Design a protein around this ligand. Structure first.
Ligand SMILES: *[C@@H]1O[C@H](CO)[C@@H](O)[C@H](O)[C@H]1NC(C)=O
Lengths: 214, 194, 226
């Protein structure tokens, strides 16, 4: 299969910005490269075909270039309706393959996450599982690192993260990290902490509790 | 708008036949008889149309397929032919509507010691469907032993170089081929004669 | 206006079968190659299969070859994908897409119009309602700022669940996160809200959780503790 890559994986931009994103094919595909644009909950729309031709109804601020292996999509002045994920796709050879996408989101002033930690409820502990939830609320940019520490020991493999779409009102994100332990392992330790690093935080922030409101 | 045929026939570089180039022609006017009366073409065979009646017909799409093969193989570029090229590289349908144009290109496409550049597919597990193109380079597993990505015992790299040497006889000399096909569908017929 | 409308998706067990349909209007169907492209939850685009205008040529992604069969019916202006021996990793929204160029060929083209997709979910999990647990606000915050509370909606199948707060009367500052698929095959999701801490003693806060496939409808009160 011809492998398609894209760069950057994500881009923060403001209205009026010039935006350049790129797509690479693992071998020559001549100019048989298409660009699609996709917004959450919606099907992709054809934007550019055969590397440089604009689909009907696409405005002139868009252009595409490249032939062979390296292609670029350029938006000369980003408009609100352009925030989306962009995918390139080679049509030169079956099976057809797609790049992994570049998401262009709305730049806004940095906002540090407000962090909250939630111990497992007594109800759930009756059931034999402990879920510990760490919330990162209303932050920008999207990048954030959340690490769990149990009695100061770094956890791996026992947490999952979920993130919201960029908020329509304040352009922030929120994120949950859930630590899942058996009741047996949960009661083997005292201190449960999630530690967060983010551009808006000069130093990593920790929220913690001692098992049993201690 | 004159159809961009001069970029097809006079392109500096031509595709290997296994990766035959296909150019879609549309929204333009074309003078086909000028091609027929060229005296540089040693082959000019049409099917389902007359070379004369081409200028009085319109089509939805014209396709221009081009590649290099050896002189002995031009005969395989026709409907109902068999051989390595027809079976494994470039296959024309029975109801082919178009023309096959070829000319000796020994001056351009032969190189002393051999040309590495032009390739053809020698092994395939099945024959090509008409107008199918196959650019894969997976090793051909002729037997039961796995090849693990490398040529070897019963394990053949599927493409071979022609090795066009300038001193070869005409049958082993390189020929550039351009195949025109004409497609009429319900969509508007935008490419017309003069 | 060109229109493509997919149907036939649903929850299947691994190894099962399902047939997808795509009804098309607004163009000469037979002039165009047609395609199926799928999108795994939270993933990118993945091309599955094509069929030329007259049905004579078809192609498949390696991952589905030998299991899937694509076909079209000119009389019904319809495209089908017959999906046999389904695997969990076949779980995706399945789009049908029309090739841009009227031609009997199928390469070097673009997909100018896409349907909105039909969801295919391949799992061995059984229908199961969620347990709902409070995410209780901290009693330690002395700051007059906003406080966070929420509800954990753990271990349900299939998607989706819906969560409201105070019967739809509380919507500002609500974040209901997308579900995660846990290794047990069950989904989990939290819904949180930030409120003024100055209201924590007065205002009651109840999350309303509904999971139609299991007929679960739970209201969980969320209040400070001790
Ligand atoms: C290619 O170039 C030659 C000479 O420059 C010219 O006579 C011929 O017509 C050209 N072929 C086409 C198809 O334009």
């Amino acid at each position: 299969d011809i492998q398609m890559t894209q760069s950057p994986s994500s881009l923060s931009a403001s209205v009026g910005d010039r935006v350049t994103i790129t797509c690479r094919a693992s071998q020559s595909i001549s100019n048989y490269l298409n660009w699609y644009q996709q917004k959450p909950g919606k099907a992709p729309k054809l934007l550019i075909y055969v590397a440089s031709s604009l689909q009907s109804g696409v405005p002139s601020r868009f252009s595409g270039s490249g032939s062979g292996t390296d292609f670029t999509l350029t938006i000369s002045s980003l408009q609100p309706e352009d925030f989306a994920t962009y995918y390139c796709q080679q049509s030169y050879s079956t099976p057809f393959t797609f790049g992994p996408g570049t998401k262009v989101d709305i730049k806004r002033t940095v906002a540090a996450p407000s962090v909250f930690i939630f111990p497992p409820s007594d109800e759930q502990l009756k059931s034999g599982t402990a879920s510990v939830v760490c919330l990162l609320n209303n932050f920008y940019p999207r990048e954030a690192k959340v690490q769990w520490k149990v009695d100061n020991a770094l956890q791996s493999g026992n947490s999952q993260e979920s993130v919201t779409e960029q908020d329509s009102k304040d352009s922030t994100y929120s994120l949950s990290s859930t630590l899942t332990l058996s009741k047996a392992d949960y009661e083997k330790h005292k201190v449960y902490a999630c530690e967060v690093t983010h551009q808006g935080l000069s130093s990593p922030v920790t929220k913690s509790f001692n098992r049993g409101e201690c | 708008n004159l159809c961009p045929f001069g970029e097809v026939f006079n392109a500096t570089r031509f595709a290997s036949v296994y990766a035959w180039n296909r150019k879609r022609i549309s929204n333009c006017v074309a003078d086909y008889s000028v091609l027929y009366n060229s005296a540089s073409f040693s082959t000019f065979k049409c099917y389902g149309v007359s070379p004369t009646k081409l200028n009085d017909l319109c089509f939805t799409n014209v396709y221009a397929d081009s590649f290099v093969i050896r002189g002995d193989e031009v005969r395989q570029i026709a409907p109902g032919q068999t051989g390595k090229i027809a079976d494994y590289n470039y296959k024309l349908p029975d109801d082919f509507t178009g023309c096959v144009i070829a000319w000796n290109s020994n001056n351009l496409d032969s190189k002393v010691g051999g040309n590495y550049n032009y390739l053809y597919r020698l092994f395939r597990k099945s024959n090509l469907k008409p107008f199918e193109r196959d650019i894969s380079t997976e090793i051909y597993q002729a037997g039961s032993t796995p090849c693990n990505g490398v040529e070897g015992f019963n394990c053949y790299f599927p493409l071979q170089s022609y090795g066009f040497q300038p001193t070869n006889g005409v049958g082993y000399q390189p020929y550039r081929v351009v195949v025109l096909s004409f497609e009429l569908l319900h969509a508007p017929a935008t490419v017309c004669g003069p | 206006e060109v229109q493509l409308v997919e149907s036939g998706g649903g929850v299947v067990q691994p190894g099962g079968s399902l047939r997808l349909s795509c009804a098309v209007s607004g163009f000469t169907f037979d002039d165009y190659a047609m395609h199926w492209v799928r999108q795994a939850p939270g993933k990118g685009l993945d091309w599955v299969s094509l069929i030329s205008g007259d049905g004579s040529y078809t192609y498949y992604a390696d991952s589905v070859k030998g299991r899937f069969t694509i076909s079209r019916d000119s009389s019904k202006n319809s495209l089908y994908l017959q999906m046999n021996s389904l695997r969990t990793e076949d779980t995706a929204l399945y789009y049908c897409a029309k090739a841009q160029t009227p031609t009997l060929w199928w390469l070097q083209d673009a997909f100018d119009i896409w349907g909105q997709g039909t969801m295919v979910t391949v799992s061995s999990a059984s229908t199961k309602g969620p347990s709902v647990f409070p995410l209780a606000p901290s009693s330690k915050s002395t700051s007059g700022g906003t406080a966070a509370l929420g509800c954990l909606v753990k271990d349900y199948f299939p998607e989706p669940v819906t969560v409201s707060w105070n019967s739809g009367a509380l919507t500002s500052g609500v974040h209901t996160f997308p579900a995660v698929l846990q290794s047990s095959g069950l989904y989990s999701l939290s819904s949180v809200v930030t409120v003024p801490s100055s209201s924590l003693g007065t205002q009651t806060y109840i999350c309303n959780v509904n999971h139609k496939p299991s007929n679960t409808k739970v209201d969980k009160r969320v209040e400070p503790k001790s």
